[PDB]
Design a protein around this motif. Sequence first.
Motif, mmCIF file in Angstrom:
data_model
loop_
_atom_site.group_PDB
_atom_site.id
_atom_site.type_symbol
_atom_site.label_atom_id
_atom_site.label_comp_id
_atom_site.label_asym_id
_atom_site.label_seq_id
_atom_site.Cartn_x
_atom_site.Cartn_y
_atom_site.Cartn_z
ATOM 1 N N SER A 23 -43.652 -19.890 38.105
ATOM 2 C CA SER A 23 -42.317 -19.292 38.138
ATOM 3 C C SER A 23 -42.021 -18.494 36.872
ATOM 4 C CB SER A 23 -41.250 -20.388 38.305
ATOM 5 O OG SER A 23 -41.296 -20.949 39.592
ATOM 6 N N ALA A 24 -42.394 -19.031 35.711
ATOM 7 C CA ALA A 24 -42.181 -18.307 34.461
ATOM 8 C C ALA A 24 -43.040 -17.053 34.419
ATOM 9 C CB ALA A 24 -42.470 -19.216 33.260
ATOM 10 N N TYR A 25 -44.239 -17.102 35.001
ATOM 11 C CA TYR A 25 -45.085 -15.928 35.031
ATOM 12 C C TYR A 25 -44.532 -14.873 35.993
ATOM 13 C CZ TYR A 25 -49.144 -12.954 35.632
ATOM 14 O OH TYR A 25 -49.975 -11.880 35.735
ATOM 15 N N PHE A 26 -43.963 -15.302 37.130
ATOM 16 C CA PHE A 26 -43.324 -14.374 38.072
ATOM 17 C C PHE A 26 -42.090 -13.715 37.451
ATOM 18 C CE2 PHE A 26 -42.789 -12.947 42.476
ATOM 19 C CZ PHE A 26 -41.480 -12.514 42.467
ATOM 20 N N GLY A 27 -41.251 -14.503 36.804
ATOM 21 C CA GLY A 27 -39.996 -14.021 36.276
ATOM 22 C C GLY A 27 -38.855 -14.264 37.240
ATOM 23 N N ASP A 28 -37.788 -13.512 37.022
ATOM 24 C CA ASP A 28 -36.525 -13.614 37.741
ATOM 25 C C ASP A 28 -36.147 -12.202 38.175
ATOM 26 O OD1 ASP A 28 -33.915 -13.985 38.651
ATOM 27 O OD2 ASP A 28 -33.236 -15.119 36.895
ATOM 28 N N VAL A 29 -35.980 -11.987 39.484
ATOM 29 C CA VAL A 29 -35.642 -10.659 39.987
ATOM 30 C C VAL A 29 -34.299 -10.147 39.476
ATOM 31 C CG1 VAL A 29 -37.029 -10.753 42.099
ATOM 32 C CG2 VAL A 29 -34.645 -11.587 42.160
ATOM 33 N N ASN A 30 -33.447 -11.020 38.924
ATOM 34 C CA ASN A 30 -32.101 -10.635 38.500
ATOM 35 C C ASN A 30 -32.008 -10.294 37.015
ATOM 36 O OD1 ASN A 30 -31.147 -11.438 41.177
ATOM 37 N ND2 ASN A 30 -31.314 -13.542 40.402
ATOM 38 N N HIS A 31 -32.043 -11.315 36.150
ATOM 39 C CA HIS A 31 -31.753 -11.161 34.726
ATOM 40 C C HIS A 31 -32.717 -10.200 34.033
ATOM 41 C CE1 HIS A 31 -29.993 -15.432 35.319
ATOM 42 N NE2 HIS A 31 -29.015 -14.548 35.406
ATOM 43 N N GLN A 49 -45.168 -13.055 58.175
ATOM 44 C CA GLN A 49 -45.263 -13.196 56.726
ATOM 45 C C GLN A 49 -44.147 -12.403 56.063
ATOM 46 O OE1 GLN A 49 -49.198 -11.354 56.293
ATOM 47 N NE2 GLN A 49 -49.928 -13.281 55.460
ATOM 48 N N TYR A 50 -43.659 -12.925 54.937
ATOM 49 C CA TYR A 50 -42.885 -12.167 53.962
ATOM 50 C C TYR A 50 -43.575 -12.323 52.621
ATOM 51 C CZ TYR A 50 -39.501 -10.777 50.496
ATOM 52 O OH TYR A 50 -38.894 -10.163 49.416
ATOM 53 N N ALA A 51 -43.902 -11.203 51.982
ATOM 54 C CA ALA A 51 -44.678 -11.220 50.752
ATOM 55 C C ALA A 51 -43.913 -10.480 49.676
ATOM 56 C CB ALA A 51 -46.053 -10.583 50.953
ATOM 57 N N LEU A 52 -43.940 -11.008 48.454
ATOM 58 C CA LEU A 52 -43.328 -10.312 47.321
ATOM 59 C C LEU A 52 -44.163 -10.464 46.050
ATOM 60 C CD1 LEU A 52 -41.008 -8.605 46.204
ATOM 61 C CD2 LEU A 52 -39.816 -10.768 45.618
ATOM 62 N N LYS A 53 -44.335 -9.347 45.341
ATOM 63 C CA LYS A 53 -44.927 -9.275 44.017
ATOM 64 C C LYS A 53 -43.834 -9.133 42.966
ATOM 65 C CE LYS A 53 -47.579 -5.971 41.295
ATOM 66 N NZ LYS A 53 -46.918 -6.452 40.044
ATOM 67 N N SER A 54 -44.081 -9.744 41.817
ATOM 68 C CA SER A 54 -43.175 -9.656 40.682
ATOM 69 C C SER A 54 -43.128 -8.207 40.176
ATOM 70 C CB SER A 54 -43.662 -10.562 39.552
ATOM 71 O OG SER A 54 -42.932 -10.384 38.324
ATOM 72 N N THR A 55 -41.956 -7.778 39.707
ATOM 73 C CA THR A 55 -41.915 -6.507 38.963
ATOM 74 C C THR A 55 -42.383 -6.666 37.525
ATOM 75 O OG1 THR A 55 -39.594 -6.834 38.350
ATOM 76 C CG2 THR A 55 -40.038 -5.605 40.376
ATOM 77 N N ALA A 56 -42.347 -7.879 36.976
ATOM 78 C CA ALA A 56 -42.731 -8.100 35.588
ATOM 79 C C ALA A 56 -44.206 -8.424 35.390
ATOM 80 C CB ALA A 56 -41.893 -9.241 35.014
ATOM 81 N N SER A 57 -44.931 -8.842 36.432
ATOM 82 C CA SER A 57 -46.291 -9.332 36.251
ATOM 83 C C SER A 57 -47.077 -9.154 37.542
ATOM 84 C CB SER A 57 -46.263 -10.805 35.854
ATOM 85 O OG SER A 57 -45.829 -11.594 36.971
#
Length: 178
Positions: A23-31, A49-57
């Motif tokens: 979770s820390a590696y993914f980040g937070d889509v908001n803050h 399926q629903y798939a999502l990649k982090s914008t930060a990592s």
Amino acid sequence: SISISYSTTYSGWTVADYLADWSAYFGDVNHAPGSNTGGFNPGPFDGSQYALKSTASDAAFIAGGDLHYTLFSNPSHTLWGKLDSIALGDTLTGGASSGGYALDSQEVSFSNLGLDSPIAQGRDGTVHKVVYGLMSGDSSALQGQIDALLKAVDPSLSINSTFDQLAAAGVAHATPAA
């Protein structure tokens, strides 16, 4: 019963620590961040399926089952349906036009989750809360469901068990390191 697959890299980790580090590696889509929305397969707003990649990592997750997004329909902005599986790892590949989403480095997956949230619960449904939590840096809703499925197999198990302890209980198996 819940079924867990884990890379052997994580055999000695606890489920809770793996999920906290992911979770820390993914980040937070908001803050912190047109727009990285994720995608449904087949889509555009429903799929298996629903798939999502982090914008930060490179962190990514794939939710599997029978999932639906209401958009502006009543009840608005709700993800609902059957959630059978969550796969977590690094680097999303594939898509609707490819035989489905996959992770280049699949680290851990949880299957036979048995979660079913009807549309009437709106954003209060457990599916909505699990999936939304995964993108906003708070896997506590997923952790709560995992912990309950583990205890239904054996009350000594929990999200503080290691993957190796879960393999000893028959619900998890290791896979080759990526």
